[PDB]
Structures are given as structure tokens and as C-alpha cells.
């Protein structure tokens, strides 16, 4: 279930110089450790961590098919070893940038990308762990207009007979506030398979609430999952935690 | 192990359509076999306890039945087991290459339970069926009662995972900690509260079990 | 003489709550405090003295078992018989009751005399 | 005499359910409750008291056992000697049976006589 | 000659800390070391000597009883009688305390004499 | 007499797996089963009875010993004295096997003789 | 003739790491080995025998003790008297020591003599 885990999104705003510090330093942080984020989506971050080391695993995606390169990254030491996985998009099409990246504590058994109707959009990445799947999104800057559809492609993908088992949890940039997404997928007939779950504080400095999760409601136990802001890392987003509510 | 169980006083429409809920994301070992993590402590444990022992389960029914102050009703879920539950032992051994020390108490109490754990939450799909506990008062005994086929159910070709629970935390050295437990010797995490009951719109209120020290009782039958 | 002698008395579905061991007149003794599982009555204390009373032969295995119940928190029944001790400082802190038997106890029932 | 005469009788994979300690006739002596663990039959009844029977010079090494059985609440065999004890009030709460043995069991089978 | 006697002291609110177990002139000893649960005071040490003093014939229950206490660590109270032992080095490792009595504590009193 | 004499045999890395408690002619007896902690091997079965043979002094120590083994499952040493206990039926439900010692065992060796 | 007597040796902070029960020359004995909690410096092996030596009238409680230390696996001071047992094939399995003591541990000292 989703709630096993410790998820968070993150939007990196990555630059060539900046990067790098943001993966050993920030991103290190929020997931070294036992109690550390088991899965984190990331936004914007054109390159992985330079100490990542390629694992070789061609593969092949449920959706669309663009090129997803899976790395280990090392967060212990030699004598202690902690070998996460990062999954990492980059070039889309003939645009290209996608720059999405989920970390997870341990090998996807399934990868998902997803491409909404709307032809500008950045795919919609994915992993799967047993029954449960870690999806994130970047939408567009002009106030997101594709984060409707982001969440309807996702939402019709998983509807499939084949799929319906699992549970799914979408976190990532919107670039819209969680009240408007909720009326348009009002609009769209979609407001009730899933439900939306924002911090109650802004997420971008200026600036309203841009990073968040939606999750199916037919997921067991989704009630349970909180959207709590975290404090600020080296970019102009709030990473944004996913935890159980204590019980 | 091919399948294991849990006791609860939830009815099976319910449990079958939510299954059972981890109650946090504590992954220290020695805080659950003691049951430090579970509803008697800190209560926020990322394991579920399930036992591979029918009669452990009308142990646990039996331990509320004799109970003056419960009035509800227990049923035995009959749980499929996959590679996400595991045996104590291996786990035990491994630690203790790690620095870590298990006392007689904590080992005498493992011994007893038949324990395996569940690392994630466990789903519908796993849960083959219900089995109604029923309590004779005058008696003692309990008894089968109903028993419901759970329709989600996926006979899916799995087992128990053998090795060593991932992710373990290291400490520690030296611990002497309270151990939890209820009924014969049974550990806190086998008590109705030790998943979550997180169900909607089923706002049912769970009996509270008391819990003991196991320490000094064990103590008393290892002295003479 | 026997436990279950009608004219001794008994309390049903009580806990053991406090212990005492301590020494009167040469004699090792011990003391227990026992109260309502629900919280409600008046709790009730008894005595065993090793040395003294009718009682006195079992003084060893009323205190392991009533140590026992203790650390469990069971539900027991607690036998009595009234007016045995008669030290005024002894009374006073605990009670004049001789503790001659201790029952398990179900949710309807307890597993000793009635 | 053995546990293991046939003129003895014995019941596996019981629990030890419940526990009584009292004393009757100067003895000090014990009795406990035994139920099939998988809700079979009915409930056996046994006592053992310290100075009577042939029984006598195994009491605490009973009492002890049984006390262990009953905290861990593992399955047993129980072996009993039948029409022992003879005050009516004893027999009519309890039973006639003395504790004559206990024996812990695996899944197919007891380790003890039968 | 009672543990509940004005010219005994005790301390209220103790948790056992420290156990030690030797021989002094033939006879089998044991002591404790108990520290207020808030953190209080300064520590109590206490003793008991198995062929020694008017307490001897408690020795065997104060003993179970201080090792039970110990291993639960609950709340306590100790009951001592102060100059008691005479050894230079005994008393200088431990005390003068002879330990006469142990009662459990709640939150509000402890269940024994004053 | 010695337990580790070399015409006593032993059984390395074993587990208690099952205990049982009786008496006969008298005596209060118990036996032990134990199997290779690795699961290999046929199982080893001793009894003690109290009041026989020359290995009867030990037989409270050996039992508590022979339960607080049985109770933490540790890998232990058994040390047996064979053809000792005479009854047939004794013999075919248990054996002839006197137990003598038992020695904790750590991965690499025993803490007893050999 | 006291535990804490300076021609008797001490090792503090060890951990109680084997145990050991059988019998010789009519005796019931235990054995402990107990090393440094830290892993430094050489095992301690100490023995006692019930019907031998001066620190005879002790065996029971130092076994109950020794047991208890044992199960909690908690850091011990343990105090022996060198070059006391005899017979070659026990010394060498075990040692010549005879155990006179047993100590709780804090971080800093130990609750017994020096």
C-alpha cells in the first residue's frame, strides 16, 4: 500500500552548476538512513548524481516507449553499503527535456510512462513495486493546463481490467493549486476516483501550492496519506512529504 | 510457511475489502518481537505480526473471550503468505552478527509465537478466507464457526520468504526493555490494535487489551 | 479445614494490584491488595503468615501463585477468612484477613470453590 | 505405581486453562482446568494435594510444570488418576481426578505414556 | 519484631538498581542498591544475611521478592532497620541496613506499614 | 563419579524439543527429548528420577536446567549415562538413558566435557 | 571467610556467556564462562559444587544468580576464589576456581567488593 512507504516529490529548478550540490547534499539528506524517504519524485533535474553508476537494464515501459536509464547510487559507504535506485528521463522527442527522476529504496519490478493528450506535455514517469505504483509529473508553466490531463491519463491507464489491482499515488508539479485541478477534473467527471493531497501551505516562493500528490481512491488505506510541506532545501520548491497518519 | 493468520473483531465485508494496515514506519526488530513498536507502546510499527499456528489464533480469541468487559466478535484470517513475510529467526541471527544481543526472555517469548511478519500492509487479494472464533463460556473452548470465502482472493503461486527482513536497523548492544505480551504468553502484536483500523465508513471501536511484562513472568517458570 | 469452606469469604474477578513481603514475630509473611477489574467496589486486602494460623502450611504456594497473578494482571478470585489477625499495627495497614485460596477467573466464571 | 499405568487415564493436546491453589486439611495443594486446544470433548479437572495419595512426593514438581504449561499455554497431555479425592464439596467443585503426570506435544504426537 | 515497626525506616518511591549476591561467615548473603524513580536523594543500600539477625528467617522471601522487584523496576518501598551488620569492609562496600520489608508503590502511596 | 567421565556418552548441538514430568514407585521423575539443532541425527531421550541411582542428587538441578534450556531452545550438550532405568514400558516410551549433564553450546564448541 | 576478601580475585564488567550443570562425586555443580562485555582481555571460568568447600552453604543461590545474570545477559562483576577444585580432567574442562560472588555492573563501578 501506499502508505508503507515514505514518499515525497521535489522539484529540483536544476541548472548545470547547481545539480549536482542539490543530488549529494539536499537530496542525500532527505533520504540516507533507515527512517530516510523511501520513494522521492524529482522535477527538473537534467542529470543524476555523478556518483551513480549505470546498471545496464534495458527497459521496456507499460504506456509509451521513450528511453528510461536505471542507476544505482550508493548513500553508505564501502565497508557499509546503501544502494538505492534512481530511475531517470530525460530526452523525450525531438523536444526533449523531460528531466523526471524517481529514487526508490529498491528495484522496480515494473516502469510506467504515460503520455497525456495534450502534445506538449512533458510523459508522466513511473515504477512499480509489488502492488503499488510511484508515478511523477512536471506540467507546463503557463499555470499547468495539461495537470488535468496528466491525471486522466493516468486514471484511464490504470482503469484497465489488467490493472485495476493496484494502487497508484501521482506526485509532482502541477503548477496549479490543488482547488482548481479538483474542479477540473470536476469538469472532466473524474473528481471522485481520486483524491487530492496538498500541504496546506504554498510550495513555491511567491507563491501558491504547485507540488503535490493525488491518489486513487480506491487504493486501501489512502485516507491514511498526508500531504505534509517540508522544510526548504536549495530551490525555489518545498519538498512536499507523503506519510501515514499516526495510528 | 504457505499461509498464516491474524485475529480480528473486524467482520469479513470489511476486512476483505481493506485488509490489514501497518501501524507506522518503526523498523527496529527488537522494538516488535518485544512489542515496544505495537498498540501497547509506541505503537507505529512497520510490521505486521501473523502466526502459521491455527491454535495461536484461539489462544489470542481466547484471551478476549475470558474477558469480562469484551463483548465483540473474532474471526480468523486465513492469510496467504508471499515474499514479503518473513520468519524471526533468520533476522535474529543476522543481528546479532551486528552487535546485537537477544536475552533469554526475548528468546524464550519468540519460541512461543510461531511469528511471521508482514513488511507491507496486507492486501484483499492475499486473504483467502474467514473463519468465525466462537467462545463456549461455561467451557472455555472456542470453537470454528462461519466460514466465508473472501471473492478478491488470488490463489497466486507464493510462500513465506526465507531469509533476512530488509532494511533492518542495527542497535543494539544492550537493551532491557519491557516485552509486551497478553493471554499465554502471547506477544502485544498479535492484539486486535496492533494493525491499523483505518476503515471508512465502519467507525466500530476496538476492544483494548491490557498487556503485561513478560520479563518478570518468564523469570518466575525459568527460576525452579 | 478447606478453602472452600462456606464460611470463609470470597471476592470474583479481582486484580491483584499491589504485593507486600515483610517479616512479624519471627515468621516471614506477605500481603496482597486486590480491586475490581471494571474499577468499581472496595479492594481487598489479605495476609498469609507463615508461621501462624490454620493457613500456615501454605504459605510458600499462596505467595508464588499470588506473586504470579500479580505479574500477569489476571483476573482471580481472592478467598479469605475473617478476623484472623489481631496485631492492631498489622491490621491497620493492611487488614485482618487471612488469604486461604486464589481462583483463575474467565469472563463469567472463576475456577475455584463458590 | 507409574503416570503411565493403564488404569490411569490421559488426554493430549490440552491447554491448561485454568488455575486454582488452596489448602484443605492442613495440605496445601493445587488444581487445574484442561480444555482441547482445538475445541474438542469437554474440559478435564485435576488436582494434586501435597500430603495425600501416592501421588504425594511429586506435588511440586507438578505444580511447577503446570505452572509452566499454563503461562505458555502450549499444548500438553495431562494424565490422571481417576477417583482420588473424596470430600463431596472438593469433588462436585473440582473433580476426584489426581494430576498424575504432564507430557509436551509436538504436532502428531505427546512426549509421555499413554 | 515487625517490619512495620516506628523505629524501622523506609523509603518510599524506590526502583532496585543494583543486586549482589556473595558469602560472608559461612552464611549466603545478598544485597541491594535502590535510587528514587525521579532521580532523587542519594541511593539506599540494603542487605540481608542468610544465619544472621532476627530478619534471618525472612531471608529466602525478602530474597524472591528483591529479585522479582528488580527485574520489573517498579516502583517500591524499602524497609530497613539501621547498624545492623558490624564488618568494617561489609558495611563500607554496602551498608549497616538489614533489609526487613519491600512494598509495591502506586502513583498517590505505596502498600505498606509507616 | 563425574558427569564428564569417559564411559558417560554426550550429544552435541542439540535442542531441547520436548520435557515431560511423572512419577513412579514413589519418585518423582522427569525426561528430556532432544534433536540436532540442524536437524540431522535421531533423537535423544533421558530421564532423572529423583530418588534412584547415583546421579539422584542432581535431579532438582538438572531438571530446572533441563527446563530453562527447553525454554530458550539454545544449542546445548546432553550427557547421558545409557542402560540404567530397568521398567520395559518405562524403557520403550522413553529409554534406559540417565541424564547427567547438560552444557550450553556456543557455534564452535560446548561449554562442558568431552 | 567473605566474598570480598583481598586473597580473592574479581574481573568486573564481564558478561555471563555459558552455563553449565551436572554432577561429581555425589555433588551437583554448575560451571559459568563469562568474558569481557567489550571483548578484551581472557574468559573467566568459575565453578561450584554443593556439598564442597568452604563456600559450600551458597551454591544454591549463587546458581540462581548466576542463572539470572545470565539470562538477561548484563554486565557482571564476578568474584572467585583461585586454586580450589582438584580432580585434573575438571580443572582443565572448566577451571580450579570456585565462585564466591556475583555483582550487578553500572558504566562506572560495579555494586560489589574490590
Known amino acids: 500500500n501506499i502508505s508503507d512507504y515514505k514518499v515525497m516529490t521535489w522539484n529540483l529548478q536544476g541548472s548545470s552548476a547547481s545539480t549536482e550540490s542539490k543530488w549529494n547534499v539536499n537530496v542525500r539528506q532527505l533520504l540516507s538512513g533507515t527512517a530516510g524517504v523511501d520513494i522521492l519524485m524529482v522535477q527538473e533535474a537534467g542529470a543524476v548524481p555523478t556518483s551513480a553508476v549505470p546498471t545496464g537494464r534495458h527497459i521496456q515501459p507499460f504506456g509509451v516507449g521513450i528511453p528510461i536509464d536505471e542507476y544505482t547510487w550508493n548513500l553508505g559507504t564501502t565497508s557499509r553499503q546503501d544502494i538505492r535506485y534512481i530511475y531517470h528521463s530525460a530526452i523525450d522527442v525531438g523536444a526533449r527535456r523531460v528531466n523526471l527522476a524517481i529514487v526508490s529504496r529498491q528495484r522496480a519490478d515494473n516502469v510506467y510512462v504515460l503520455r497525456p493528450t495534450t502534445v506538449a506535455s512533458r510523459p508522466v514517469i513511473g515504477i512499480g513495486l509489488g502492488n503499488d505504483v510511484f508515478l511523477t509529473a512536471h506540467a507546463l508553466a503557463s499555470g499547468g493546463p495539461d495537470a488535468a490531463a496528466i491525471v486522466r491519463v493516468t486514471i484511464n491507464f490504470f482503469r484497465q481490467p489488467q490493472m485495476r489491482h493496484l494502487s497508484w499515488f501521482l506526485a509532482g508539479d502541477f503548477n496549479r493549486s490543488p482547488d482548481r485541478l479538483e474542479n477540473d477534473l470536476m469538469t472532466e467527471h473524474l473528481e471522485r476516483v481520486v483524491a487530492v493531497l496538498a500541504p496546506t501551505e504554498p510550495t513555491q516562493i511567491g507563491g501558491g501550492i504547485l507540488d503535490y500528490g493525488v491518489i486513487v481512491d480506491r487504493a486501501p488505506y489512502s485516507q491514511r496519506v498526508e500531504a505534509l510541506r517540508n522544510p526548504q532545501l536549495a530551490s525555489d520548491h518545498y519538498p512536499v512529504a507523503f506519510l501515514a497518519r499516526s495510528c | ?224 | 479445614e478447606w478453602t472452600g469452606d462456606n464460611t470463609n469469604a470470597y471476592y470474583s474477578d479481582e486484580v491483584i494490584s499491589e504485593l507486600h513481603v515483610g517479616q512479624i514475630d519471627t515468621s516471614p509473611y506477605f500481603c496482597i491488595k486486590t480491586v475490581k477489574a471494571n474499577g468499581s467496589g472496595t479492594p481487598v486486602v489479605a495476609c498469609a503468615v507463615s508461621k501462624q494460623s490454620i493457613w500456615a502450611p501454605s504459605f510458600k504456594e499462596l505467595l508464588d501463585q499470588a506473586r504470579y497473578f500479580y505479574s500477569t494482571g489476571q483476573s482471580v478470585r481472592i478467598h479469605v477468612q475473617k478476623n484472623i489477625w489481631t496485631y492492631p499495627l498489622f491490621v491497620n495497614t493492611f487488614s485482618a484477613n487471612a488469604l486461604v485460596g486464589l481462583s483463575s477467573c474467565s469472563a463469567t466464571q472463576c475456577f475455584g470453590p463458590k
Open chain 2, 1 to 224: 510457511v504457505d499461509f498464516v493468520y491474524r485475529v480480528d473483531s473486524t467482520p469479513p465485508d470489511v476486512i476483505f475489502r481493506d485488509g490489514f494496515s501497518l501501524l507506522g514506519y518503526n523498523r527496529n526488530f527488537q522494538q516488535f518481537i518485544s512489542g515496544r513498536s505495537c498498540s501497547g507502546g509506541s505503537s507505529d510499527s512497520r510490521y505486521i505480526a501473523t502466526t502459521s499456528s491455527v491454535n495461536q489464533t484461539y489462544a489470542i480469541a481466547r484471551a478476549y473471550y475470558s474477558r469480562s468487559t469484551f463483548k465483540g466478535n473474532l474471526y480468523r484470517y486465513q492469510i496467504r503468505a508471499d515474499n514479503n513475510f518473513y520468519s524471526l529467526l533468520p533476522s535474529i541471527t543476522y543481528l546479532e552478527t551486528q552487535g546485537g544481543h537477544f536475552n533469554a526472555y526475548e528468546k524464550t517469548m519468540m519460541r512461543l509465537q510461531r511469528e511471521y511478519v508482514s513488511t507491507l500492509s496486507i492486501l484483499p487479494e492475499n486473504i483467502q478466507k474467514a473463519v468465525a472464533l466462537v467462545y463456549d463460556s461455561a467451557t472455555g473452548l472456542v470453537k470454528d464457526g462461519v466460514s466465508t470465502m473472501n471473492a478478491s482472493y488470488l490463489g497466486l503461486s507464493t510462500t513465506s520468504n526465507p531469509g533476512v527482513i530488509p532494511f533492518l536497523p542495527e542497535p543494539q548492544t544492550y537493551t532491557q526493555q519491557r516485552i509486551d505480551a497478553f493471554g499465554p504468553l502471547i506477544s502485544s502484536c498479535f492484539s486486535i490494535g496492533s494493525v491499523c483500523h483505518s476503515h471508512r465508513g465502519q467507525r466500530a471501536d476496538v476492544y483494548n487489551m491490557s498487556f503485561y511484562d513478560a520479563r518478570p513472568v518468564i523469570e518466575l517458570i525459568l527460576s525452579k
